[PDB]
């Protein structure tokens, strides 16, 4: 047989459904999600890290002049300073006064911490969504294997093929450009490897951590050495990667809506709760027994003994039956008012059992089916005294959940007497029209 | 090894979580809501302060210090009672739906 329905996109709450093959005993089916990972497709454009400017030894040809070529180096610098007359240890360097030459070249390269901490720049594109489901049906125990969340690919769990339908929302928490620094990801724009504004993020850009081509503009400017010493000074703006580490805002795993938890190694966005997921499960024909070997109940009367508004299993109801024979048969409430904690019950000849439920209604008018037979339950509920708890709701809050019997009485008094007032005006209008017509002829 | 903050004193009111924080170092406290909008707060606590956070039925998640994050959900307790005189029915639905009964009356 095949049972198709739609489940909500919530993780810790199982979805209970009762398949109904006529002529066979019903089978209680329970589908529970474990994970929900939205995995986009990324490509790595470039990385970035703090630089380390290295200075070669300057040449001192100090009777004459020297010139340089243009070596291929990121942010390479040349200068010639004339008439320096330096003073090393053990006297002055050379005899020629007031005409000298010092080169003092410089060159920018990446540091040795770039292997440990760096920021990876990614462009994302919408990709696969997959999830892990824990399932059971009938007497089969819990067996789990992960599926693909698209309405095409079936997955064999146990002996039943499950086709998890597409999500109703196309929402993904990643913008088109993300930065992955260490443990957390961000939503930040790139200069796209061509430009670098020397102080914000792309002062140093490298395509791979071991790559040989480097982009570097750090405004490296050479400076004249002073007072007759051999050293090479320079001035440059600080690294923007070190500045980005100070000013970075909150990461994406702290501002994500719908309670998404962001993981890293395939760049998942795990356990979001948005939309709904349709299902379609093909159940094997060997899991159905004939109805002549199962209990069948009649004369059902349902009484609710205690009900509580809270979203904990505080609702209790006992019903009275008289089955045809002893055995086990499941229970289920198909309406959206209350969920049922129990899966199956053990029966006898003319006994009574109790089940625990959970509802968000003041007056639960739900019905439940036991042993392919339905019975309507009614009662009143009281609010709880706890204000904040640390578990999610088991039920679903509707629109007319909070309206009580006294509030319905005041609405019907208001609506009923308003229309009765305005109809009496319409009745009395048509009454004097007849007696004015009857005056003439 | 990084320092661990002292535990806050949590106090519960109707749709409000109150946190009494007594740190000894400048400590980061970041919260978010588990609904369709995150509405995120982020602040460094240096002196002993108290902060009140509004928790709806969707949830709230707060991280304090180097502790693991904790999630809290708000129930439907309320203040009035729905059965009774009209000065009690109106009060109960105002504490539950504060805007809908203003334009509903």
UniProtKB/Swiss-Prot annotation, chain A:
Topological domains on the Extracellular side lie at 1-417
Q: Name it.
A: Spike glycoprotein E1
Topology class, membrane: Single-pass type I membrane protein
Q: Which cysteines are joined by disulfide bonds?
A: 49-114, 62-94, 63-96, 68-78, 260-272, 302-377, 307-381, 329-371
Summarize which stretch of the complete protein this chain spans: 802 to 1242 of 1242
Task: Describe the subunit structure.
Answer: The precursor of protein E3/E2 and E1 form a heterodimer shortly after synthesis. Processing of the precursor of protein E3/E2 into E2 and E3 results in a heterodimer of the spike glycoproteins E2 and E1. Spike at virion surface are constituted of three E2-E1 heterodimers. After target cell attachment and endocytosis, E1 change conformation to form homotrimers. Interacts with 6K protein.
Which residue ranges are assigned to the Cytoplasmic compartment in the record's topology?
439-441
Residue segments, region E1 fusion peptide loop: 84-101
Parts of the chain that traverse the membrane: 418-438
Question: What subcellular locations does the record give?
Answer: Virion membrane; Host cell membrane
What organism does the UniProt record list as the source? Eastern equine encephalitis virus (strain Florida 91-469) (EEEV)
Q: What is the recorded function of this protein according to its Swiss-Prot or TrEMBL entry?
A: Class II viral fusion protein. Fusion activity is inactive as long as E1 is bound to E2 in mature virion. After virus attachment to target cell and endocytosis, acidification of the endosome would induce dissociation of E1/E2 heterodimer and concomitant trimerization of the E1 subunits. This E1 trimer is fusion active, and promotes release of viral nucleocapsid in cytoplasm after endosome and viral membrane fusion. Efficient fusion requires the presence of cholesterol and sphingolipid in the target membrane.
Tell me the superkingdom of the source: Viruses
């Amino acid at each position: 047989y095949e049972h198709t329905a739609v489940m909500p996109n919530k993780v810790g709450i199982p979805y209970k459904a009762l398949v109904e093959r006529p002529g066979y005993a019903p089978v209680h089916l329970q589908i529970q999600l474990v994970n929900t990972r939205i995995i986009p497709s990324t490509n790595l454009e470039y990385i970035t890290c703090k630089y380390k400017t290295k200075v070669p030894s300057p040449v001192v040809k100090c009777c004459g002049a020297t010139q340089c070529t243009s070596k291929p180096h990121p942010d390479y610098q040349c200068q010639v300073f004339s008439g320096v007359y330096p003073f090393m240890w053990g006297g002055a360097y050379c005899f020629c006064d007031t005409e000298n030459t010092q080169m003092s070249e410089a060159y920018v390269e990446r540091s040795e911490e770039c292997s440990i901490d760096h920021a990876k720049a990614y462009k994302v594109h919408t990709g696969t969504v997959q999830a892990m489901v824990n399932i059971t049906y009938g007497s089969v125990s819990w067996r789990s294997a992960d599926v693909y969340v698209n309405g095409e690919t079936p997955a064999k769990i146990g002996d039943a093929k499950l086709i998890i339908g597409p999500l109703s929302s196309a929402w993904s928490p990643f913008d088109n450009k993300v930065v992955v620094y260490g443990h957390e990801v961000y939503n930040y724009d790139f200069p796209e490897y061509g430009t670098g504004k020397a102080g914000s993020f792309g002062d140093l850009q490298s395509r791979t951590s071991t790559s040989n081509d480097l982009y570097a503009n750090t405004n490296l400017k050479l400076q004249r050495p002073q007072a007759g010493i051999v050293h090479t000074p320079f001035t440059q703006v600080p690294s923007g990667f070190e500045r980005w580490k100070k000013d970075k805002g909150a990461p994406l795993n702290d501002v994500a809506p719908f309670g998404c938890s962001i993981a890293l190694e395939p760049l998942r966005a795990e356990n979001c709760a948005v939309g709904s997921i349709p299902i379609s499960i093909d159940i094997p024909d060997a899991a159905f027994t004939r109805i002549s070997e199962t209990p069948t109940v009649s004369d059902l009367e349902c009484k609710i003994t205690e009900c509580t508004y809270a979203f904990d299993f505080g609702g209790i109801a006992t019903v009275a039956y008289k089955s045809s024979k002893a055995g086990n048969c499941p229970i289920h409430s198909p309406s959206g008012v209350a969920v049922i904690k129990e899966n199956d019950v053990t029966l006898a000849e003319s006994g009574s059992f109790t089940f625990h439920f959970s509802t968000a209604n003041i007056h639960p008018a739900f019905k439940l089916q036991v042993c392919t037979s339905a019975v309507t339950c009614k009662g009143d509920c009281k609010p709880p005294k706890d204000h904040i708890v640390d578990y999610p709701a088991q039920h679903t809050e509707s629109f007319t959940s909070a309206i009580s019997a006294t509030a319905w009485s005041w609405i019907k008094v208001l609506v009923g007497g308003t229309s009765a007032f305005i109809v009496l005006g319409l009745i009395a209008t048509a009454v004097v029209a007849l007696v004015l017509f009857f005056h003439r002829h | 090894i990084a320092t661990l903050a002292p535990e806050p004193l949590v106090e519960h009111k109707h749709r409000t979580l109150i946190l009494h924080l007594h740190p000894d170092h400048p400590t980061l406290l970041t919260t978010r809501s588990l609904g369709s909008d995150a509405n995120p707060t982020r602040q460094w606590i240096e002196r002993p302060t108290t902060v009140n956070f509004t928790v709806t039925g969707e949830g709230l998640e707060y991280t304090w210090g180097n502790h693991p994050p904790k999630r809290v959900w708000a129930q439907e307790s309320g203040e009035g009672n729905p059965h009774g005189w009209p000065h009690e029915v109106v009060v109960y639905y105002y504490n539950r739906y504060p805007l809908t009964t203003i334009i509903g009356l």
